[PDB]
Amino acid sequence: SGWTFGAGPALQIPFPMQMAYRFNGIGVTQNVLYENQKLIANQFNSAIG
Amino acid sequence: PAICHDGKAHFPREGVFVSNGTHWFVTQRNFYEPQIITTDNTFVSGNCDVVIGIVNNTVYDPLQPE
Numbered sequence: 633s634g635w636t637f638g639a640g641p642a643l644q645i646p647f648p649m650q651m652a653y654r655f656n657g658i659g660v661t662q663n664v665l666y667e668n669q670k671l672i673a674n675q676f677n678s679a680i681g
Numbered sequence: 682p683a684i685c686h687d688g689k690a691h692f693p694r695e696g697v698f699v700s701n702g703t704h705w706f707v708t709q710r711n712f713y714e715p716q717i718i719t720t721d722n723t724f725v726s727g728n729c730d731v732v733i734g735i736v737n738n739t740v741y742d743p744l745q746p747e
């Protein structure tokens with residue numbers, strides 16, 4: 633649900649769109665995520681690993 | 682995530698793409714206020730072959746009729 637559950641009712645949303653919102657919040661346009669989605673996922677999976 | 686009109690991907694400038702079941706609109710995130718997907722609401726950057734989940738629809742040009 634993103635950050636919506638901390639304010640009012642929880643509202644569902646697909647994870648890639650939430651990640652696009654999170655990128656947009658730091659000054660990078662969302663089209664950067666979608667065109668580099670798979671790669672980014674890998675960099676996350678390694679980071680936890 | 683994105684709408685492909687003619688070999689090009691369109692992303693919302695500020696808002697999300699929603700659909701009632703037959704047609705597509707663009708709206709805000711904290712309040713329901715649908716609008717018509719024109720060339721102002723959206724910006725184009727892509728090639729319509731890399732986004733995962735792109736859908737087919739038509740955008741509207743406010744200058745062609747005039």
Ligand SMILES: *[C@@H]1O[C@H](CO)[C@@H](O)[C@H](O)[C@H]1NC(C)=O
Pocket residue numbers: 737
């Ligand atoms: C979207 O439109 C293009 C060109 O009109 C077509 O090649 C493609 O198959 C369409 N995709 C879907 C899912 O209908």
